[PDB]
Amino acid sequence: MRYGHFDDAAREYVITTPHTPYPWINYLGSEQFFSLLSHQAGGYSFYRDAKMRRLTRYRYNNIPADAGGRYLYVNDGGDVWTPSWLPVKADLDHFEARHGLGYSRITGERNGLKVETLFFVPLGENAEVQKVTVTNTSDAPKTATLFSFVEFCLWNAQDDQTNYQRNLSIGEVEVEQDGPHGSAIYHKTEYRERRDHYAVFGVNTRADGFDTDRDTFVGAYNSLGEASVPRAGKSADSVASGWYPIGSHSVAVTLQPGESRDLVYVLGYLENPDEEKWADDAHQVVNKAPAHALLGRFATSEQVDAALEALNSYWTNLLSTYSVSSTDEKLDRMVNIWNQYQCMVTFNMSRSASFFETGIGRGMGFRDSNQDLLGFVHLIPERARERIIDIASTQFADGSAYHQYQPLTKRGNNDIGSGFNDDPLWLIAGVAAYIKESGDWGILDEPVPFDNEPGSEVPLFEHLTRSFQFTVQNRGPHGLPLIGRADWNDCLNLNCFSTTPGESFQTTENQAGGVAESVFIAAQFVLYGAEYATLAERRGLADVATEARKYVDEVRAAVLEHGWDGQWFLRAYDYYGNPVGTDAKPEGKIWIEPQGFAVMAGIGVGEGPDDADAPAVKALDSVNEMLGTPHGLVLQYPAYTTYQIELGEVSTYPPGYKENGGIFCHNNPWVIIAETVVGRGAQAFDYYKRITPAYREDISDTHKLEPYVYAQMIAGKEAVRAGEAKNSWLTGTAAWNFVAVSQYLLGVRPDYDGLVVDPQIGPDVPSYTVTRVARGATYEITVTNSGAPGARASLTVDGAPVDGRTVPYAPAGSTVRVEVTV
């Protein structure tokens, strides 16, 4: 069952019904202002920080879901309906929602009146613009009144939802019916005090009426679907004083058959210099200069169209760096559009706000943002550069770091815990990926502070040495890295032993002592420790590099000597020194993380894919057999059926969900990459298809969430809801799958001095061409792939055969034609 389809030419997903399995959203904005917009106009907007500067209010777990957003009530001769269907739910003759890149169009038609709304955040603007087109599709004149509606949030989302004892008395607004370009409403709660910002909601026409008080607009005992004002046919011109401020304007229109009318609405975030906050000496009236300027830039449809066109050009440019043309339109669709679009979203949102993440406790994750860089560096390297600096600035002198930082202030916090020992290494991963992509070796010289300490700056490279040394100086009795709070797996807390209900394992105090070690961090250290060594060598630090490689060899040696269970890699050693993830236990016999990451590091790789005796092959074979399901690879097997106190949060989840038997998509690409490493491209591509959006669209009724983006987890084989996803959009799954498909499956990956072309995708993709812009040059890579296992590519460049699979970077401005034969 499907509820829409992909429109590749328009780079949009077309949702053809309001009746989807779950609200399907799009993200508007790619700079500092963002909007979560569902196919039913639901959601909210915020500036830089979803917790601290949320413009509008949204209710998670509402009944029904997603009943609240940007609505346009249409009163046609007494009949009231909304084109987004919800909240009124009046029968519509036609409905369609198109989610595009940075914009969405939602159209609803009922009884001869069609209303189309274009939603988007213009480039360079901290605002959400709506271009509404009302068309009389009947054969007779029509007169209707349109009521816009948005519910404001009191900036601090957390305060908004919990501190009514105070905030029900602070709501303040200003009303400007006769502004320079039309009518506008100003939400200025706390502007009288510490806030130098306010929100504006206006329309490019002089409104017939307005409303700023929710209770008056909606009416007592009524839901948004039964709003009194629209039903009455006229605004109540309410002026709020506390309680719930809203933005609403009414506009009556008369249209002859076939005639249409445009209306442009703007929801904007404005700021004023402290000395320019007030229009009056008494400091009672807000200075509207920036608001009047904003409304002026979108006073006409022509201005809107120009901005939309600029946005389209912006995306065409971003997507011009990596593209592919093959015989698989689902693959191409993901690689050329959707996976890259999603990587921009994760780069901006981290794991903070979606229709699952509430935009409160989570900011920008240290681990999360570093990994997102992996799939974002080719898009806008200059912004990836700044992000690296912001991230490394929240790192501590000893190498450890804040697990996340507040988006608004860029300062780290422990709101979701601290002491995650896998964090430090991810910084090296990010910098390495960035340097391979840009060749910007100078970034290593950038002065970077520790915990934003003015005057504590040291070269970025020094930060990497702190990260590297942290792991070296924190290994257990087996020579494996100590796990600490937890490694990549947030629920593997071996230093917890909590018996206190309700207290988060993520933040709860941990027990000192013990010998808990992580096999995953060991693999992570081997993989990224090598990159550090390489970076140190290029920097002229020969001894440091030599030393670094010694440690790397020691750790990998430990994995093979103390991290092997027999047919797969061990997961870790608990607080007691006992093995975790061994066949010796009845549950949690094999964990996926080390299997994929150890092989990615090259640990246990043998003669070839046919070497059934190489550890890597045995491990991946165990992964296939024990963790495989038609929906992807489950985290571990069997899932824990009883609380295992020495393991922490993991066993608290019912079997088959999240970290306990759920398909945690984020780690699937590691197995995909591992498979290409051992030379089994066919299997790697297989795993890729099981979890990729375009391939799962045909089972939308099972996946349930957005069919155009990856989700964090799909219920596993042990779950009653097997195959059903949760936590869509914000997940490292996007960055990692893009790395997997673009760099390992399609095989085009940037290295320090050359571009590697190493296809390993199997026989399902026999021929394809990748256009890759790297270091200012364009590489047209034509591939003829037999897909034979173990078969590696041979190259020919500009007519002449070359040695190996690394094409040294050609000078900027050139076009290199690489002919690849696998």
Next chain:
Amino acid sequence: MRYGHFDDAAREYVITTPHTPYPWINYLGSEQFFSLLSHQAGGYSFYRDAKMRRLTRYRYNNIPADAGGRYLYVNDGGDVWTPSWLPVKADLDHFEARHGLGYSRITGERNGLKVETLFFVPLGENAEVQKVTVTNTSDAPKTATLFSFVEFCLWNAQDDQTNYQRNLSIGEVEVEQDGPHGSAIYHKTEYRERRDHYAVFGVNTRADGFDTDRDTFVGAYNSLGEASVPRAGKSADSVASGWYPIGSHSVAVTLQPGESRDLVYVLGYLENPDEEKWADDAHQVVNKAPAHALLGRFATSEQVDAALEALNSYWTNLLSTYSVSSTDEKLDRMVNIWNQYQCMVTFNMSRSASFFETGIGRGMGFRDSNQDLLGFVHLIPERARERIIDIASTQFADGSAYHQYQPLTKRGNNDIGSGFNDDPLWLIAGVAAYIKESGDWGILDEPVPFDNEPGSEVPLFEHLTRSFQFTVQNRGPHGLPLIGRADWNDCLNLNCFSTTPGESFQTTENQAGGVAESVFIAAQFVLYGAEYATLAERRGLADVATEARKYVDEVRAAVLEHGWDGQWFLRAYDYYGNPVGTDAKPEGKIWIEPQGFAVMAGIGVGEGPDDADAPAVKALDSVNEMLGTPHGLVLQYPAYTTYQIELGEVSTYPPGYKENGGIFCHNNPWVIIAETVVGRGAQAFDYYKRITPAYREDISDTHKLEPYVYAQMIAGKEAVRAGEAKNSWLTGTAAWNFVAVSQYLLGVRPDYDGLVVDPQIGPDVPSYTVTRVARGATYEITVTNSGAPGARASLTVDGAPVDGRTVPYAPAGSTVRVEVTV
């Protein structure tokens, strides 16, 4: 004007329409299990802690408000309606909601079927019981199917509302259609791990069907008012797996004309010893022993009725300590029932959970629980004693204390601030009130630790000396106590100077240095410092006592010399030594707190009510003129119209609301008491009536909130919403108003060595009789009041005239009859 009426004989408030200005609630329970229940069945229940053990989910700021609670969908031939009106909102032939003491009855009738529901929490039980009576009021036999409904909360309310990324995968339940006494549903989320508790929702009959998944019961795209299952007329027998667990049973009923049937539903909280949690070896089935037992205790209507009568006898007994019979039934109503009922609620709830306080951040405030004791000690002295010990156990060795403590752990925390210099003295206030009431001097010897520290125990009296000494050693340049973070007024933050938005003035770090002083703490010290001295004198500490009264003398002198502005007392001195609350400033000229408290402490009192030269009189006259309004006395005048950086949070509220010009009811009783001290009983009684429920019932459309309980704040004179209240139920206004009316207006107040009878209520109550049980004896106080200004009483006890107004305590079991002439 009115939406119901008081029913004194039944001790209930009868709401005669579902269309009230705002949801009006009642609190069920008085021990460890509590329920918030609106007149539309909205609300939720929790065990001991509203944040960590919430059984059911409730949405604050929902659209519409209060859409969610204990519903019973009646399907009669396809027509579906709910007796609580919401959420279906079907036209009812009859509707009524009676809120009583620890129970409520909601009745709705539609098309021949009347459904009455009795809600209550039985004594000694951790459960909410519903006794439903369905009656066929037609002349023909009828049939219908009733669907019960309750939405579970995942215990941790904070996590429930924000951590969906995790909790949408942990919801777990168990269904038992064929139990020992009927059908039962079990909500056992996280019982699998650290929780030793689960909830049960059962009915005393074998249900036809059930539902545990919200989405299935309600249906996609539907609100609770459009629930699919009830409309279909058949349960879907859903078994939840994550998402949203609910409790619902379908019961088919058949009734002959005039016939009725009872159904008993139970929502219970159960715990099992760790070693008896499971019924199976595999640990997958919860041990239902305690649940079965509970359900058995409420399997019949007879058991419910017996429990209700025990509850009634319980309240009759509690209300037998202080009673009054006068010519004013509104006064009697408040004194005899409602004010005392509310004091029991505030004692249990503090300021944690109401339809305004969200039951998340606020626990049990030090200052709040000490003041609540003032109006609760006569009800259950043993519990008051226990509360004092728990409270003082969260005090630090230097006198200061945790501003509040978590109800479940009784451990302090800084979640809402710390370092409020008025907190310490409230401990003395609470103990003094308890000693005077009980005569239990032994409590002073009770060993109490500091911050719950093992081995730190010292006698409770020492705790009081630490409080007393903290103020003496923390005075500023004028000899007035330093204010610190703030005094009683949480918004007077003189050491804040915050320019950073979002940051709560309550938690933000204050600046060191400065000489900020509080005139309020000065008056508080003079008042309770004297009480401390008396306690010391009784313990034989002439040394300690003598010095103590000297300090009181010094501070008293300081107030008159440095805290007098000319026509009223100064409020404070800011960080730079600048006066606050002076006529020299344009705004915030006079603040109410010091006026009432200074006079209560006897500061500035002269020759009588007409001594125009007395500071106390000048101050009170100023209060009347500048702060008086028909709805009570505003905190200060005029309100601040611009942000005063050096004053903290106070000026951030728009004029007329909360601490900035609002009527903060809590401090009105201080002026009421002050007026009785000065001898102006008529004016004191006037103020009492302006803010008291029974007197404001006639303007319910203006007060908006519950007409039977005090609220924290009523919009003041400068607010466009003047007269409208917010934050009902949970406020110290209840305890202080009871003190004022019972001890100073009516004049019956316990003293250390006797019961003082000092009426001072004015001419509006010419005669009344108070029945007071004190120290085991019953005092029948017959008062003949002239109400003459300044006129105070002369007493005759048991046919023998006496001198003064203090009747020494008669032996227990006695009945003394005191004739009072005023």
